Amino acid sequence: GTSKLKYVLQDARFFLIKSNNHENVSLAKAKGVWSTLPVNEKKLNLAFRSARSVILIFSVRESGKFQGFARLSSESHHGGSPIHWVLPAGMSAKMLGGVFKIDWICRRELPFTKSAHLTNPWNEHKPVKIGRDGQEIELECGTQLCLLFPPDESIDLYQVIHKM
Numbered sequence: 001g002t003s004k005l006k007y008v009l010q011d012a013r014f015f016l017i018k019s020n021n022h023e024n025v026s027l028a029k030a031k032g033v034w035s036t037l038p039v040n041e042k043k044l045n046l047a048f049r050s051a052r053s054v055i056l057i058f059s060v061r062e063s064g065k066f067q068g069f070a071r072l073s074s075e076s077h078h079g080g081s082p083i084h085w086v087l088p089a090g091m092s093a094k095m096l097g098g099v100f101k102i103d104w105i106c107r108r109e110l111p112f113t114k115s116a117h118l119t120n121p122w123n124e125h126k127p128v129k130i131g132r133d134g135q136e137i138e139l140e141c142g143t144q145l146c147l148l149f150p151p152d153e154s155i156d157l158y159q160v161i162h163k164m
């Protein structure tokens with residue numbers, strides 16, 4: 001069903017996450033972690049304290065799709081297990097040092113063609129697929145985008161709900 005998903009998305013904030021490569025999104029799905037550039041890291045840390053749920057919606061650049069979405073379960077933290085990110089042209093591990101823990105809500109893909117009817121008020125009502133890494137998505141647009149994804153029947157949202 002969709003009832004527990006709607007409960008998790010209640011009063012959530014949504015952020016677009018753009019990755020330069022598929023390898024880091026696969027690593028993120030396997031390990032439950034994400035790292036971003038310092039400007040977005042500060043934005044996400046502020047949002048984590050302010051909202052019942054912060055939702056990251058992932059899109060690999062040039063893929064024409066979203067690769068899934070996840071809930072932040074922690075603020076960023078330094079040290080800890082070193083994540084072996086594949087680094088873009090000039091993106092040292094120092095610029096990705098903060099690690100957020102995340103709980104995946106959906107690991108299924110959604111092609112951009114299926115979201116063409118959704119526009120983001122916080123990006124000049126451009127289609128929601130358009131936006132820079134870290135772009136915030138307004139509540140109503142973000143909720144409807146997350147409901148567009150195929151159900152991920154391998155995920156049990158019971159444990160996610162207890163962390164709210």
Ligand SMILES: CNc1nc(Cl)nc2c1ncn2[C@@H]1CCCCO1
Nearest residue numbers: 018019020021024035036037085133
């Ligand atoms: C493990 N996290 C990341 N992995 C990769 Cl490949 N790229 C990233 C990541 N976080 C931010 N970016 C941005 C996307 C816009 C252009 C500069 O890079």
